[PDB]
Design a protein around this ligand. Structure first.
Ligand SMILES: OC[C@H]1O[C@@H](O)[C@H](O)[C@@H](O)[C@H]1O
Ligand SMILES: OC[C@H]1O[C@@H](O)[C@H](O)[C@@H](O)[C@H]1O
Lengths: 133, 132
């Protein structure tokens, strides 16, 4: 299910994205994108890409159709056949990624938080819910 | 009377996650964000679910006196039931989330930078209190 949540007014420091779901057996990878528009090729303030097939999580941004330098977190905190809960929290200096009870990584802002207009979740994941507080 | 200290306070983006159960014969419990360890210290936020009178009260305490009470819509808590609460600090206030929904937005009355301690007390069965 390619999930999309529209955020007309954008987000601000103090915004929390909570994503719950299940990593199916044989999943290769999935992603959570914070995009700056609803069209194809829109800039991505955040590309959060857990890769079960290569065992790592990649963070990146996309601007003018071109990717920035990837950041990687300490191992993959997801497992095939197991549910998970991810909190992506917007702060003044970056996005904190919390995976089930522990801070996993901090991704410093590359694009203005104010330009984020859409959240998309896709890939090999079976979503329970996506809530924005 | 669970106390979790926050040296270097909290800022926009700080998230408080509280998990526990409301005892079967619970009257009320509270979550306080205080500006000091000493008793009677100022409270930037007082979140007080009252199961006896069926109302959730929000308030602050400055120089010993309670401020103007604010109430959320109804009581999202039930006796004998487990719960998860998120208190999110932003630039304009604290967002209280109960379950899967935003319950109330309490706008700042005291400086966020004066927040030094979190306290959870009253009739509540605490599972965990995590700060992100
Ligand atoms: O840097 C992030 C990008 O890395 C590429 O290797 C991948 O094909 C893209 O889908 C995206 O994940
Ligand atoms: O308004 C907040 C305060 O209200 C009082 O009536 C109560 O005794 C205090 O414990 C606190 O809840």
């Amino acid at each position: 299910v390619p999930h999309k949540s529209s955020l007309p007014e954008g987000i601000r420091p103090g915004t929390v994205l909570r994503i719950r779901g299940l990593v199916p057996p044989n999943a290769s990878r999935f992603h959570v994108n914070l995009l700056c528009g609803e069209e194809q090729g829109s800039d991505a303030a955040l590309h959060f890409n857990p890769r079960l097939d290569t065992s790592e999580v990649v963070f990146n941004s996309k601007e003018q159709g071109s990717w920035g330098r990837e950041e990687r977190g300490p191992g993959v905190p997801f497992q095939r056949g197991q549910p998970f809960e991810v909190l992506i929290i917007a702060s003044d200096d970056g996005f904190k990624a919390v995976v089930g009870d522990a801070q996993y990584h901090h991704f410093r802002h590359r694009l203005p938080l104010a330009r984020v207009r859409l959240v998309e979740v896709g890939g090999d994941v079976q979503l329970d819910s996506v809530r924005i507080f």
